[PDB]
Amino acid sequence: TLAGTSSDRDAGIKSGVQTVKAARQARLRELFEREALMYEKELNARGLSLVKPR
Amino acid sequence: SGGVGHSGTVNEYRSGVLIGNFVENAAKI
């Protein structure tokens, strides 16, 4: 289904569109984590580095 | 055991144990 019924909003169950959106966000985050782990090695091959948060 | 009655028994062991009647258990023209 695309959306939720009237009982879903009370039961707290998220709608189909909401759940698919969240899952998509998180899969994307995984991909960019892999990409960052690759870029760090590619930079240290040259002697430069990414900046890391504090 | 028993609620409002108390039984009187003695335990029975096998042939080897020395009990109240071990000698008679051993006895068995």
Partner: protein
């Protein structure tokens, strides 16, 4: 020698459905009807390698009957020996006694007659019914009447399911119970009571099943029945037949009501625990914690007892134990009968049903005793019947079905009479 059993009501054929499982397991009969002469008292051997019990299940609702017809024992139970009415009696004596009785009892006795004709050495009938319901009470009374007028001289051992004082599943069960007694007196020769709260206490205390159901109750009641038919079935050192309960336990034509008991009631692990000997289980079968009927033999006086023993039993120690129970004083006897015991020994140890909670025991005791605590039971039920009848409650169901106040007043005064007899005899 043969004995046939009939089951009436919703309770009747559930006890039968556990009892006949036990018999097939005891004689090693597969549920499909054949093994892979001790059986001849229960199963008749048809044709070649087939057995068909000497039983009739009967009820007025077809639901529990065709549950049996579609259960495990489809091939075992013969099709005709399960009688099924089209509609219930519905907790109503007169309904089960006057309208539907007239249309089912003739077919029942027609069936049972050719059961008795196929039999040869018939000992008697033994019946299983519930007096709280409609079918067991109403046409149970009707069929017992027509059995008594047809055969009569044969024994009719009755195991009846009475209402507990506090635990109750119905409301009009006082009416149905009372109207059942008025025929339970002069049609049953030897009647054994079987309450429910007592067996609930048993399965909670000793077998320690925290959440029991009816099937558990049925299985150990079936164990009791097997333990008192074992004498006819199996070879014993001192046998005791159906004619003995008639003689050694009924000293008066209107006093036939027995307390039953059983020992050892034991779990699977407590069997490893306890040292099972003869004297302590003979003691265990006397305390009210192991009786099948909720009553107190402390406040009553015993009249006569019978003790079936199964298994490895020598007459020496059982005679020694009853000698100790006679020299005890906490339980007391009436001065009428100084030799208030009968024993009976069968060699076969009881079998174990897969899925039951009772372990394999070497020896077992079934005590069927008479007392006056039953005279206390009927008064306890009498009081709560009068409370309801004082307001003419529920009466219109019976009157509209065809009866009147006559059988109400007459059955109420009958219990009053039986009260007078029990207090007179207990003196």
């Amino acid at each position: 020698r043969e004995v046939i059993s009939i089951h009436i009501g919703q309770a009747g054929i559930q006890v039968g459905n556990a009892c006949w499982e036990l018999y097939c397991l005891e004689h090693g009969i597969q549920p499909d009807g054949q093994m892979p002469d001790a059986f001849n008292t229960f199963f008749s051997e048809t044709g070649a390698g087939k057995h068909v019990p000497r039983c009739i299940f009967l009820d007025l609702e077809p639901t529990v009957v065709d549950e049996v017809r579609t259960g495990t024992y489809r091939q075992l139970f013969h099709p005709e020996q399960l009688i099924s009415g089209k509609e219930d009696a519905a907790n109503n004596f007169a309904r089960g006694h006057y309208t539907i009785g007239k249309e089912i009892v003739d077919l029942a006795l027609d069936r049972i007659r050719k059961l008795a004709d196929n039999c040869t050495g018939l000992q008697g009938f033994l019946v299983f019914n519930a007096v709280g319901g409609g079918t067991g009470s109403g046409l149970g009374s009707l069929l017992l009447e027509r059995l008594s007028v047809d055969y009569g001289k044969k024994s009719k051992l009755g195991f009846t399911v009475y209402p507990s004082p506090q635990v109750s599943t119905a409301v009009v069960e006082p009416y149905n119970s009372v109207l059942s007694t008025h025929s339970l007196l002069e049609h049953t020769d030897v009647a054994v009571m079987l309450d429910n709260e007592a067996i609930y206490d048993i399965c909670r205390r000793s077998l320690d099943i925290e959440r029991p159901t009816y099937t558990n109750l049925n299985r150990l009641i079936a164990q009791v029945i097997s333990s008192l038919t074992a004498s006819l079935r199996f070879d014993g050192a001192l046998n005791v037949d159906i004619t003995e309960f008639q003689t050694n336990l009924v000293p008066y034509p209107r006093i036939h009501f027995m307390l039953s008991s059983y020992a050892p009631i034991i779990s699977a692990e407590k069997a490893y625990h306890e040292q099972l000997s003869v004297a302590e289980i003979t003691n265990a079968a006397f305390e009210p914690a192991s009786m099948m009927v909720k009553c107190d033999p402390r406040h009553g006086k015993y009249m006569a007892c019978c003790l079936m023993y199964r298994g490895d039993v020598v007459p020496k120690d059982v005679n020694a134990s009853v000698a100790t129970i006679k020299t005890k004083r906490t339980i007391q006897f009436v001065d009428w009968c100084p030799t208030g015991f009968k024993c009976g020994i069968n060699y076969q140890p009881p079998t174990v049903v897969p899925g039951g909670d009772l372990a394999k025991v070497q020896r077992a005791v079934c005590m069927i005793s008479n007392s006056t605590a039953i005279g206390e039971i009927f008064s306890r039920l009498d009081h709560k019947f009068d409370l309801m009848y004082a307001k003419r409650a529920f009466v219109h169901w019976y009157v509209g079905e065809g009866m009147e106040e006559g059988e109400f007043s007459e059955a109420r005064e009958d219990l009053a009479a039986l009260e007078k007899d029990f207090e007179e005899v207990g003196a």
